[PDB]
Swiss-Prot record, chains A, B:
GO biological process: phosphorelay signal transduction system; regulation of DNA-templated transcription
Domain Response regulatory: 2-116
General function of this protein: Probable member of the two-component regulatory system involved in the regulation of the [NiFe] hydrogenase activity. HupR1 is probably phosphorylated by the sensory component and then acts in conjunction with sigma-54 as a transcriptional activator.
Keyword Ribosomal protein set for record: no
Protein name: Hydrogenase transcriptional regulatory protein HupR1
Gene giving rise to this polypeptide: hupR1
Any GO MF annotation of the entry: sequence-specific DNA binding
GO cellular component: cytoplasm
Residues carrying 4-aspartylphosphate: D50
Keywords annotated in UniProt: Activator, ATP-binding, Cytoplasm, DNA-binding, Nucleotide-binding, Phosphoprotein, Transcription, Transcription regulation, Two-component regulatory system
Amino acid sequence: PAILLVDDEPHSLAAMKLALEDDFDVLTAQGAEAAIAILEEEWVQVIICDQRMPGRTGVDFLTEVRERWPETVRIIITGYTDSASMMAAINDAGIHQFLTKPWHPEQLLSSARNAARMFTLARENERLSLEMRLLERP
Amino acid sequence: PAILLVDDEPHSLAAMKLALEDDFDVLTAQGAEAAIAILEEEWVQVIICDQRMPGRTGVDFLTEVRERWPETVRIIITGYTDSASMMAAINDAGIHQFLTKPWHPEQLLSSARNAARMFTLARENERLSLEMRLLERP
Ligand SMILES: [Mg+2]
Ligand SMILES: [Mg+2]
């Protein structure tokens, strides 16, 4: 499964991809609409999304991601981290973690890695419980 | 299992505990030596440790934590996040993530929560694989 990166600024998006591509299959989208189109057509484990994008915010986009694909791990990149209403929006959206803007490359890589590990572990957990049913009960 | 917090400054340590205690059993230590004593005697899932402490650094302490209890999730709090040698030390230590100093309360809470979830998932994964052996093979 892929990591999907969503950012309206082309150079930030490209640099984020460069940071992760030695470690993950990377998909990129320039805004929420393009990103939803990718989520509908590709298998995505982790979404990293910028908050401030023309039109639809990352918080709104990721709120919908939680609704339609709740097993994804969802990360938001945002400034105004000292804003209690920003923080309350991120929590209400079911976002797993935020990264402070300008995103820190080492921190982004670690978040993507920890996020992918949580995803793998949860998918393996499900598979193991299902295989136990195919062994137990008859 | 508990979250262990390690910080030499008593007020930061107390505030970190206040941030997490509605969500976790919290243990506290004022430096690496006291923290190792706790790890030897209590069941700990997550360790959050300050880097700069009199004598032993968080990086050194957490390096030893990786050796003796590798299934813990380990977080370091550090300044100088723009230092490539700091970053290389954290990576070499097998530390899962860093938080930038002064630690951000919402970010600390999210890291502790994601860390505990990874721990739970990995322990459940092991348990499920073992229970499958008690069903398969005879
Ligand atoms: Mg933007
Ligand atoms: Mg200190």
